[PDB]
Amino acid sequence: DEANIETHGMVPMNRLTDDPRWLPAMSERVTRMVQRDRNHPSVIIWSLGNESGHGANHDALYRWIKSVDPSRPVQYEGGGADTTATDIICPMYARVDEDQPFPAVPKWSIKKWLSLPGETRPLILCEYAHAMGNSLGGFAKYWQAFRQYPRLQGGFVWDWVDQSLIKYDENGNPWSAYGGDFGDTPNDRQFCMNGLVFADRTPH
Amino acid sequence: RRDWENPGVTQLNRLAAHPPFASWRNSEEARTDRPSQQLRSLNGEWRFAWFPAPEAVPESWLECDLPEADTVVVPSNWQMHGYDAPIYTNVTYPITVNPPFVPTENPTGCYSLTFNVDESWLQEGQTRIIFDGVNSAFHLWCNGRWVGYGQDSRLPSEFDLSAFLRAGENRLAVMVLRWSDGSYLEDQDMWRM
Amino acid sequence: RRDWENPGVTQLNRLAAHPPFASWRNSEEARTDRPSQQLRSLNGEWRFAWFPAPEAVPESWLECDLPEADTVVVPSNWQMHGYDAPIYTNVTYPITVNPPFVPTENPTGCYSLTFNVDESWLQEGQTRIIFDGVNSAFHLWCNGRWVGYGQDSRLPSEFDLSAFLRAGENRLAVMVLRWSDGSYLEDQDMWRMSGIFRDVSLLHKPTTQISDFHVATRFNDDFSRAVLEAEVQMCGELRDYLRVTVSLWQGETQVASGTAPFGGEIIDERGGYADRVTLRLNVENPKLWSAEIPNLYRAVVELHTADGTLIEAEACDVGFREVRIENGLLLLNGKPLLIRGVNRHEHHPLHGQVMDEQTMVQDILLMKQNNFNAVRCSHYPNHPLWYTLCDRYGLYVVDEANIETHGMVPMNRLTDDPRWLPAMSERVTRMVQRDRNHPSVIIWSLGNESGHGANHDALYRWIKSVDPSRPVQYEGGGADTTATDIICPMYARVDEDQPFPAVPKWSIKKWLSLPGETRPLILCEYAHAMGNSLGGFAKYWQAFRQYPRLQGGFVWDWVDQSLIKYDENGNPWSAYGGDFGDTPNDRQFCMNGLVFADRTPHPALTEAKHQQQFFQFRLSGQTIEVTSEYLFRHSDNELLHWMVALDGKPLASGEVPLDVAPQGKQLIELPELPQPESAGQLWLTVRVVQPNATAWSEAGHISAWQQWRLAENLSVTLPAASHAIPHLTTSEMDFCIELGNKRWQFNRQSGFLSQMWIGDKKQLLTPLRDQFTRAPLDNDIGVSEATRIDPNAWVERWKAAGHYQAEAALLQCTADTLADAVLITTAHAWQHQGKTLFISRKTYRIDGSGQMAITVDVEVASDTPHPARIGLNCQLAQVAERVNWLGLGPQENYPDRLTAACFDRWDLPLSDMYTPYVFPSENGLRCGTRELNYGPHQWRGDFQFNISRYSQQQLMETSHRHLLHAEEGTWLNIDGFHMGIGGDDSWSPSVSAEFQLSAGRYHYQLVWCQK
């Protein structure tokens, strides 16, 4: 279960999340979630939100939760996927064997990540195997690792269904539309279709 | 007050959050997860009218129905009805980045409903309204009088109408803003509706 | 909107918090911390009208000064000027508890000011208004246009008037509400006042300005090398040519300097901060900061153009010091502290809660002069100057957020509530943001008496997160929660457990060793100094020294919060709870200080000083061993003085220079010491003197002392040839004794010494009688009320037992003649509701020498409460100017509070023998006295005594010291034994067992004679 908090477009990412003046707003997004959903057995992990860097607001919110509801681990990927605001190393698109040492927020091979000096947390990819169009090339390689390494505990594929919408042609013939099709601009074109299933639930 | 341009203000008069309630007045129903007389749906046909900015809305809409209004289904997304377009933007904010301000031309949806309230509800106890999802911020009026304000397009916003309703017919007025300071917190990679 | 009844609204249009700024336009003014033409004070003469409610405010006030308005000085508390009453309530909220609402009649202050503004200010730049402190909420208008709103009475609220001001004359309008949703977080145990109590000023900043800056200092292993790191942020337009220079000075000497353009390191996938820059400076051999040697550097931050043109400069004092907890110990600069602290409220007898520099400096010096090295800001951020001062004089400070909800039921009612997280967080984040650069601040505190809720754990984490340089502590919820790095209890006893349910207060020695516990333990409040208190202070100090992880504490508290009241003669008197018509109220409970509100010390102050000494001493043979408890300085402003006296008569003495390394020892051998010409006890006294004056002391200041008995020679010399013989004159009513120009009369029915004469002069106003009670001290009283008694309080156990009502029944009264003496024997009973409380058996022996020998044997039933005292007392007919004695002094001292007193021969004016506590009680006693002198009288033995113009009765019958009236004569209380006074707490019995008079059988003897 994940808080409605994402500030990706800020420069740098943690602009608002590190801002004490935004803690209040952020906190209601976290506290109100937990207050509503804490009796559901299905919820096994709480998430602090998505792609908002890593701000002090995160560490405070992380503690609030651990403190009001110990029953569940708390995770969060921002700021490099293994900060002090996450019980779980939850990277997005870290590869199996290949490292991608971006500055400040590198994405290590998952196999490698687990054993970095000092590290001992489990690792579950929060997003992996981007299913855009003709994709899922190399899927088996993750599975192989998942089964061989005890601490590599799986992941959440990105993602379930294309975010295509319906528009009608001159005969009222419906067709799947993407970014820019509604005269929307600027837009991300086909980047909103990345699922395992078509918008109508038909499998890819 | 321009509440929608201040992260210091994310709600007004909103009731505290809590696990799902139905206030069953029969235990066995509660046990069975059956419907509850005390938990009514307002879903369905409503009155709606689009404006380009909150400044364009007529005070008259608080008191009485906008004759230009159409009758639409709720819940819904007004873009799915063509009042305006949905925008697909991944990372870049669909509005200029100048927190906590939002554009002046800020698409506004004026939703309205005339509904019944049984006196039995009014003789005792408390009558609250619950909106499970309003994107991105809104003001609410009941029978012409202001009730409160809310943000966070993805959690329920609850208000006590106990002192605002009357037995019988009643009118709600909801002014929904497309953009608000809460929009800064909602930069997900998906359509902007 | 009634923003004042909504915790979701804490402010409107309020600018962000930041470290102290001054916007200098000259670097040098900056480095030297001189005034800046860009920071103006608007303090002084303002207009004020009082209202009962905001709704009654003439909306005209907005545009025009109202006429009924008076002219008053600001800052100020309106209660201080008489528009209304300040209220003294401890726990009980002064308003009905119904969060978030406040009462409808809400005293409203209408402040307004007509002032001129320099257009140069308006043509460019930004002009902000700054309210250092507004109690509790306010709305702001400028030239009739609304500006904004703010809460939190203890931190600065700032607004941008750039667009509201006009060339020339202008009007500010300020509506301050007494109560607001903020009061809920302001339940501190102190007076409830209101208004614009801290400074008001204007700050002009350029458009492109420095908006915040953080200074860090990290060290290598032996602190031989440091890195000064300074993080700088800006507001305005960024440009390539923009620069920041950070330079570091040790006075006139520029130690280091660095320059960079804006642009931080990459921090995320989104990059980094374009509008920030971090400069780093190496410092070799830093001169380190401590409360022992407050070494500071000056940090100057210039925002300038690449051409060299300065835009503005900001600056701060820097202290190189590291705070860390390691292996269970609190270290400073790698060394374990020993906190000799005190809690201190911002209070002024006439100014209420308005603070001034004079007062601050006065407090600090007293502090230092009394060996205090630390202070806790109970329970809110202090006026900004305090910190600059602590920085410079050197005091370890505990900075505490303004969050106290003691009146909630249960206490963490709001703090565990997510709807109160935001208002709470601002009270903590805005504190940190403003004070983080001060080196005197070594620990953060989450607040006071708010239970422990989830909001605390969240805020505990934000801090650790933003400023890892300082531990975080909080005492609520048990003193050892997950929201504190230090076990910081309040009033936990040294050896005594007090197992309250859920939040027990273990004995500190035991608390450290609980299974699994490893933190350090420093009490946030201890030794409640209320009235005649501080009993057992030495027991804490002994433990702190013996146990490494016991690191000291903060006494409660510095100064009494009594306000000044004037009688019809326009004579001032110190007032407390309820004297303002305020109710409900907590009476004298706002008076718990080591000094009077006027800064005159209470006697306990001296006890603190001695226990908190930095040099320990040991004696052996002719060998004295001085051990320094300093951790960083050598005894470079100290010399040792020693003196040997025989029963106060000086024999020998001398001085030796001290030269002790921190933690070291020095052995001073003493010279061969001549023996003495007669019986008596020799006593050695040493004292540590500081030859030179310092910033906080004068040349010759004594910082420590100690005493030891040396050899003793018992008198064996047999009196002498009785010159004459007392004659006894027996009547059916009296036993009369005559010897020369003296007579003693013993009433045969009473069994007491009814009268004594010298010449034809009567010596007594009332007979000499045993006394077993004392006019109740604050500590004896505890919480006990006349409407709600605390049957557990000492006073209550005593009253109930009939001790203050017991009556003397004669059991036996005889007179016998000896070879050369007259001997009277008596036996008395003290009963109550048919039980014998005590039995007093005496003998009076009158010899030809004319001395009256008294022997007292008392019996105290095992089942009666232990008595306040066991002695005799009388009202002397005489009044003399001086009191001279040989024993412990010079100041008032009791059994559990006499370590700092010294045995010698003392002489003071009668008045120094009476302690003027506001709440009168037994006071002024002196222990271990071997000889007492008054008028032509002399008493000898081994006893304790007090002497003044007030009977115990009058004292215990009076509540304000200013209603006391000098009785006829002189009241004399001479005790064989006196009960300790306690003080661990003043709300329950705190007198230790070894200070209780429970032996059952007591024996004392005295000799009264004449000179």
Ligand SMILES: OC[C@@H]1[C@H](O)[C@H](O)[C@@H](O)c2nnnn21
């Ligand atoms: O479809 C790409 C996805 C999508 O934007 C996710 O919301 C985001 O967490 C992400 N990060 N990297 N790639 N993605």
Ligand SMILES: OC[C@@H]1[C@H](O)[C@H](O)[C@@H](O)c2nnnn21
């Ligand atoms: O003077 C009594 C003091 C005063 O109330 C302090 O503010 C509070 O922390 C406290 N708790 N217990 N005793 N005290």
Ligand SMILES: [Mg+2]
């Ligand atoms: Mg808002």
Ligand SMILES: [Mg+2]
């Ligand atoms: Mg994203």
Ligand SMILES: [Mg+2]
């Ligand atoms: Mg408020």
Ligand SMILES: [Mg+2]
């Ligand atoms: Mg309190």
Ligand SMILES: [Mg+2]
């Ligand atoms: Mg010396």
Ligand code: NA
């Ligand atoms: Na695995």
Ligand code: NA
């Ligand atoms: Na996508």
Ligand code: NA
């Ligand atoms: Na110790």
Ligand code: NA
């Ligand atoms: Na008090």
Ligand code: NA
């Ligand atoms: Na008294």
